[PDB]
């Protein structure tokens, strides 16, 4: 325990700046795939695990496949539900899929929904479902982005981990859901986890004058380390200044 505020991601090139953070005050958090740590080295397992004594852990894992057709890697997962106990962490977040569409129709829903209450099953966790950037739309769709994520979440009964950017990406790329629409109808009691990496800043203090509450926020990116905690210090001294203004709590994980 415990996770809250602003955090960065694991990087085995950040290792140095990681490793000399005497606490978790600035850096509050960070985040690592299961897909990276599972192919860790010794030694770069055992400089992950020294940092993981100070810096809290989040996984948020890239390859489940959670919308996919392929049978769940059982490999994969109980690799994740190996890391939760070991770095006593309850969170786990992946995303839909990674040529073809992805349609956001009630049959995606209801296989995907199923797939993600046999995750919560097996990790004997509810997971989060993170909104991603996708190529094409399919025609078949019956419902647009928010839809089909609120709806499966509100199926499967899981949270949301909402990154700003890719609201903004699938916004410009398809020009189908104004970014203000998208938060303004998403399941934001739901929201326990956010990604940040000029007008999608504006998005963030949008999500967060909507929250009920002040979730877990990473910078999501290579420059230096420093840097990188500047770049949070800010993201955090954003998030002080709507829990002050709107009275809220830390979502604490
Ligand atoms: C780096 As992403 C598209 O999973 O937020
Ligand atoms: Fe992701
Ligand atoms: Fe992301």
Not at 29 to 58: C, H, S, T
Not at 85 to 106: A, C, G, R, V
Not at 158 to 184: E, K, M, R, S, T
Request: hydrophobic share 40%; with cysteine; glycine share 6%.
């Amino acid at each position: 325990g415990m996770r809250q505020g602003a955090g960065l991601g694991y990087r085995r090139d950040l290792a140095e700046g990681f490793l000399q953070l005497r606490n978790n005050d600035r850096i509050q958090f960070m985040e690592i795939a299961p897909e990276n740590w599972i192919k860790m080295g010794g030694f770069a397992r055992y400089q992950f695990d020294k940092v993981a004594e100070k810096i809290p852990i989040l996984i948020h894992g890239l390859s489940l496949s959670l919308g996919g057709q392929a049978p769940l890697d059982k490999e994969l997962l109980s690799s994740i539900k190996a890391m939760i106990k070991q770095y006593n962490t309850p969170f786990f977040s992946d995303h839909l899929s990674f040529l073809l569409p992805m349609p956001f129709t009630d049959e995606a829903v209801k296989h995907t929904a199923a797939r993600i209450r046999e995750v919560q099953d097996f990790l004997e966790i509810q997971i989060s479902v993170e909104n991603t950037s996708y190529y094409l739309h399919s025609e078949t769709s019956t419902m647009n982005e928010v839809e089909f994520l609120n709806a499966i979440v509100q199926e499967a009964n899981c949270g949301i981990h909402l990154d700003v950017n890719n609201i903004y990406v699938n916004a410009v790329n398809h020009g189908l859901l104004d970014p203000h629409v998208f938060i303004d109808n998403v399941d934001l009691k739901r929201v326990n986890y956010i990604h940040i990496a000029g007008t999608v800043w504006d998005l963030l203090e949008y999500t967060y004058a909507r929250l009920s509450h002040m979730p877990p926020t990473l910078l999501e990116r290579f420059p230096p380390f420093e840097k990188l905690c500047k770049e949070v210090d800010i993201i955090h001294q954003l998030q002080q200044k709507y829990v002050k203004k709107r009275g809220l709590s830390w979502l604490k994980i």
